[PDB]
Structure 1
Amino acid sequence: RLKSSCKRHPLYVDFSDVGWNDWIVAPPGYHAFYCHGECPFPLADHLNSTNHAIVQTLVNSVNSKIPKACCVPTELSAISMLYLDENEKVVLKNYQDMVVEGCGCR
């Protein structure tokens, strides 16, 4: 766990490995992706940072006791899941914030 600038990485999630296939009927898993990568001080353009992230990035370069801005997901999307609630009812719900579309520094 350590690499260049903040970016999106591939990550398929199998519901059976995380023990969710018990309640999630479908899909069996999904391409979720994830974010990772240092948020540099010279602030990459392409990479987006909130004003706070920028302020913190700068402070960090003049004082290291303060952490750099983290590389988290900034753009997400949803996926459908057919599952069974606590009462064994079959539900088809559209779950938000499941897939990482874009990454950024925050």
Structure 2
Amino acid sequence: ALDTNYCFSSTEKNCCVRQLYIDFRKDLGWKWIHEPKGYHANFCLGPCPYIWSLDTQYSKVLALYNQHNPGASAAPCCVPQALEPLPIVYYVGRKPKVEQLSNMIVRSCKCS
């Protein structure tokens, strides 16, 4: 349950959902969307120690390796698990159209 619900509810040094806002024009150079002018994408940050949402088998061994070998580089990394859509409005000429952009918001992270 490494979601925005848990992670935002606390400070948390391990892998977790972090606040992030993106301006469509300032950050992507997307000049074509009408609303919103940007959105809260969030991102995944934090170390992946053993027990901490190691889902795959390889994660477990890899995390475990890292314990018995601290300064290693080799470690599971914190990445998104659940992604959610973002509804927007853009004009095509002066007809407005609503599209739903898939997987734009991270709601939860994992270690991989």
Whether the aligned pair in 2 keeps the contact of 1:74 and 1:102 (CA below 8 Å) is: yes
Cα RMSD of the aligned pairs, angstroms, is: 2.6
The structure whose residues are more often helix, as a share, is 2
Partner of 1:23: 32
Distance 1:95 1:48, change over 3 A: farther
Unaligned runs of 5+ in 2: 1-11
TM-score, scaled to structure 2:
0.72
Matched, 1:102 2:108: yes
Unaligned runs of 5+ in 1: none
Instruction: After TM superposition, give the deviation of residue 93 of structure 1 in Å.
Output: 1.8
* Greater shift in the superposed pair: 90-99 or 55-64: 55-64
Matched, 1:70 2:93: no
TM-score, scaled to structure 1:
0.75
Whether the aligned pair in 1 keeps the contact of 2:54 and 2:60 (CA below 8 Å) is: no
Residue type of the alignment partner of 1:36: L
Q: Choose from 10, 33, 56 the match for 2:19.
A: 10
Instruction: After TM superposition, give the deviation of residue 16 of structure 1 in Å.
Output: 1.8
Whether the aligned pair in 2 keeps the contact of 1:59 and 1:66 (CA below 8 Å) is: no
Q: Secondary structure at the match of 2:74?
A: coil
Q: Choose from 43, 53, 57 the match for 1:34.
A: 43
Percent identity reads 35
Q: Choose from 32, 38, 59 the match for 1:53.
A: 59
Q: Secondary structure at the match of 1:16?
A: helix
Instruction: After TM superposition, give the deviation of residue 12 of structure 1 in Å.
Output: 1.2
